Design a protein around this ligand. Structure first.
Ligand SMILES: CCc1cc(C(=O)NCCNC(=O)/C=C/C(=O)O)cc(Cl)c1Nc1ccccc1C(=O)O
Ligand SMILES: O=C(O)CNC(=O)C(=O)O
Ligand SMILES: [Fe+3]
Length: 432
């Protein structure tokens, strides 16, 4: 099973006892200035068509998200879920103009929600009482917001909530991934809008992980209400979104764990790899400074990282971002040139092996074979993922592109797309 709403007497007390880490600040606590600005920005972004269903992966299947979405946040920052790296439409941190102003708005919302979170965490530590301020400020330092939209009347059939009779679901039970440990989440909910929950009203539901005996909580969400998941709530509880009648937007502010997920990070990875390359001039004659297994391993790993975590993730989104911003165009051109050089590196390593003394040759194979086989496997999986039935139905605005890709002819490129043959020979040689 069952569930509790504010209609139930036990709700208040389940909340007080067992969800102290969940906070609700109702629309009343937020200036009607913000509301109009935030809500106008949602409706702007929608009109311009900045929100897209993402083509994700779940249990090995290609699925559009029920929800349309866009990521806004720090420049150069990314947020990865369900094996999809979302790139940030930049907000004006220190350091179009319609779209740009919405980004400014959601930044403004971000500052607001941050201050509320710090307060609530402060009050939460004070209750626990009956280093600390460092942790707290880091756990509220939102760097992105993932905006969301669903019009439920455009969906033919919505999933029933399976455990507690909560009715129709917009988003099923999950945790938010790729967040800093014990980091908070703050949500601004914008509804365009009795046995159990009102089906016409949107709700956020919560349950304890693993547990469908403890009745779940369904929190009504009216226009401009905010909720906060504090501390370890996101990890120890699941949440879902229960649809109502009308369309509904939301802004989900998060502290993305972006240690391997910023532009600066991956640029620096590329420069590390190219330290092994004689860099007098950019030509097709790539010569490497060392052939020590560990620097070659490292090089071929970085190559994989720029190729799959960045290039193919980016182009798989058919430059959807390009409608909103141009910010990533040059960086994705620079990463591609950096990756091209690396194809040059891999060719030079293959030249060196096919020249050594076997023992030296075999240390090299051993260092690189895992990276080359992953490269082959992930290229197949990405190529396919760009071909899927569902992918081919998207509009041209959003068609997956399989960049980088080249034909077996293309003599601009020194190695083939398909590495099967190359990988075969290398394994063979190791077994000599
Ligand atoms: C499963 C529900 C869901 C989860 C999340 C999410 O970010 N989760 C991060 C961790 N991973 C998991 O939750 C699960 C992984 C797995 O089972 O492989 C985000 C969305 Cl938007 C979403 N919703 C849907 C996505 C596509 C298709 C239908 C849905 C739906 O909700 O029915
Ligand atoms: O904001 C909401 O409650 C709906 N969206 C999400 O929960 C999400 O994006 O994971
Ligand atoms: Fe969520």
């Amino acid at each position: 099973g069952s569930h509790m709403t504010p209609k139930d007497d036990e709700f208040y007390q389940q909340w007080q006892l067992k969800y102290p880490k969940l906070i609700l600040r109702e629309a009343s606590s937020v200036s009607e200035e913000l509301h109009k600005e935030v809500q106008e920005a949602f409706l702007t972004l929608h009109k311009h068509g900045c929100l897209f269903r993402d083509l994700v992966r779940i249990q090995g299947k290609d699925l559009l998200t029920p929800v349309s979405r866009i990521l806004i946040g720090n420049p150069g920052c990314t947020y990865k879920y369900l094996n999809t790296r979302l790139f940030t439409v930049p907000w004006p941190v220190k350091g179009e103009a319609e779209i740009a102003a919405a980004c400014e708005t959601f930044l403004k919302l971000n500052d607001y929600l941050q201050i509320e979170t710090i307060q609530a965490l402060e009050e939460l530590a004070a209750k626990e009482k009956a280093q600390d301020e460092v942790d707290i400020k880091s756990r509220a330092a939102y760097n992105v917001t993932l905006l969301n939209f669903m019009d439920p009347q455009k969906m033919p059939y919505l999933k029933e909530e399976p455990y507690f009779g909560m009715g129709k679901m917009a988003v099923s039970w999950h945790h938010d991934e790729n967040l800093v440990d014990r980091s908070a989440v703050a949500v601004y909910s914008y509804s365009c809008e009795l046995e159990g929950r009102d089906p016409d009203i949107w709700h956020v539901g919560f349950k304890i992980s693993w547990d469908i005996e403890t009745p779940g909580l369904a929190i009504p969400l009216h226009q401009g209400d905010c909720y906060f998941m504090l501390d370890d709530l996101n990890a120890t509880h699941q949440h879902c979104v229960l649809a109502g009648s009308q369309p509904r937007f939301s802004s989900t502010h998060r502290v993305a764990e972006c240690s391997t997920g910023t532009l600066d990070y991956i640029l620096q990875r590329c420069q590390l790899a190219l330290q092994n390359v004689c860099d007098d001039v950019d030509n097709d004659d790539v010569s490497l400074k060392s052939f020590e297994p560990a620097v070659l391993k490292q090089g071929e790993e970085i190559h994989n990282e720029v190729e799959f975590e960045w290039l193919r993730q980016f182009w798989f989104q058919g430059n959807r971002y390009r409608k909103c911003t141009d910010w990533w165009c040059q960086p994705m051109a620079q990463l591609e040139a950096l990756w091209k050089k690396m194809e040059g590196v891999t060719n030079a390593v293959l030249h060196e092996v096919k020249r050594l003394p076997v023992e030296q040759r075999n240390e090299i194979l051993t260092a690189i074979l895992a990276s080359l086989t992953a490269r082959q496997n992930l290229r197949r999986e990405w190529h396919a993922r760009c071909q899927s039935r569902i992918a081919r139905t998207l509009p041209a605005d959003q068609k997956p592109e399989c960049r980088p890709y080249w034909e077996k002819d293309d003599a601009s490129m020194p190695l083939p797309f398909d590495l099967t043959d190359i990988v075969s020979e290398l394994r063979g040689q190791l077994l000599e």
